[PDB]
Design a protein around this ligand. Structure first.
Ligand code: E8O
Ligand code: E8O
Lengths: 10, 211, 211, 10
């Protein structure tokens, strides 16, 4: 789940 | 506290035909992340549980979005890409069955009761705070968040529409139809991914990957 | 009028492990017909629509029945045939996934809130009066019957449990889980019918036939 | 739907 992880942290 | 004002502001801040539909679903997955961050107390949850809730409800969350958007039209749905998919276009593509279910069980019923954007966001917040999601580190906390959402929704309904005592229950009774239509939508996405005849973008592909 | 007394009386009047489960489902299909006749105004509907409602909800109606019956046990379900199917028995038969979903999302949640038999019958009455059922001659009449049911249920909850203002909404928020578990149960029944390794009795076989 | 029909009429 790489895309969802990167958008949630920013 | 779970105020319906912030929930409405979350909605207002983010707001072959099968190929056009899949592209719109991928674009809205990026928008769904922005919407969830504006729902109260969602960002305060553990980062792993935010993934679990979004991976479990993204299908129902996006379906409720375009179904309420499609209230303006009468025989189709309005994609977020500005394109309109008509009844016959979906039928001519072989996906008229689930398309009719979206129109009769969701779009028309949303149009019949004049469901406002605040009630839509509260329902999508209820779908977001799903305490039955597998793997939640604290499902009771998510359950408490869901309870605050439909508490603020019932108060909003009995205040904004006091002449309709059953409006609050009528809003919640669209969630079973939302759940079943969502599962049938996942079957279609898996089938197109399995065959590989329809281009699926990265974010939509990531949501179809196994847990 | 839709009194909760008659709805409760309808419940009180009717109240390889996979093979034992399918036999219990067939026996309860005969019982389901007797239960529906005791629900107010159901027999007054056209005979064709009574078939449509029972053929559309029998899965969720029977699932809500044994899930509430299984409150007595902690790691299994209580079949109407007096037999108990344990967690490990369902797991050892290869059907532990849907069995765990019934226990966590339905049985345990019914046990947590101490859902009484009146609230169970009102929910099964709401499932029975499904206005989204395809082919209904007058879906607005079925929709009106559903509205009278959850109106009497909300009054019963705010009278019997006034200390729980969110109990009425918490009861309705089990219907989405009931809908999804019901669909997964139908997939299992179709799969066993397709392979033909599990004996399926006549009434259960009739409900699996296409419309 | 023969079985369901016969049980509903009786
Ligand atoms: C849930 C994700 N999904 C979405 C994905 C697939 C769909 O059909 C399944 C087959 C026919 C491809 C539909 C409907 C046409 C039923 C919606 C979308 C699509 C667009 C939008 C949007 O434009 O907002 C939101 N969700
Ligand atoms: C909906 C019909 N169904 C029923 C049918 C199938 C089921 O698993 C599907 C696979 C594993 C066979 C289950 C559960 C074990 C999930 C329940 C039953 C069975 C028994 C009773 C009852 O004893 O009251 C009621 N409904």
């Amino acid at each position: 789940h790489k895309i969802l992880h990167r958008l949630l942290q920013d | 506290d779970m105020p319906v004002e912030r929930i409405l502001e979350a909605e207002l801040a983010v707001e072959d035909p099968v190929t056009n539909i899949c592209q719109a679903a991928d674009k809205q997955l990026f928008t769904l992340v922005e919407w969830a961050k504006r729902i109260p107390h969602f960002s305060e949850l553990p980062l792993d549980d935010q993934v679990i809730l979004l991976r479990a409800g993204w299908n129902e969350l996006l379906i409720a979005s375009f179904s309420h958007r499609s209230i303006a039209v009468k025989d189709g749905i309005l994609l977020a890409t500005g394109l309109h998919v008509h009844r016959n276009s979906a039928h001519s593509a072989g996906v008229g069955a689930i398309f009719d279910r979206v129109l009769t069980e969701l779009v028309s019923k949303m149009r019949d009761m004049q469901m406002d954007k605040t009630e839509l966001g509260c329902l999508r917040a209820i779908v977001l705070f799903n305490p039955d999601s597998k793997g939640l580190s604290n499902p009771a906390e998510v359950e408490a968040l869901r309870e605050k959402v439909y508490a603020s929704l019932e108060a909003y309904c009995k205040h904004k529409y006091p002449e309709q005592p059953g409006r609050f229950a009528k809003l919640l009774l669209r969630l079973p139809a939302l759940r079943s239509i969502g599962l049938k939508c996942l079957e279609h996405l898996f089938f197109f991914k399995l065959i590989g005849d329809t281009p699926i973008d990265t974010f939509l592909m990531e949501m179809l990957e196994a847990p």
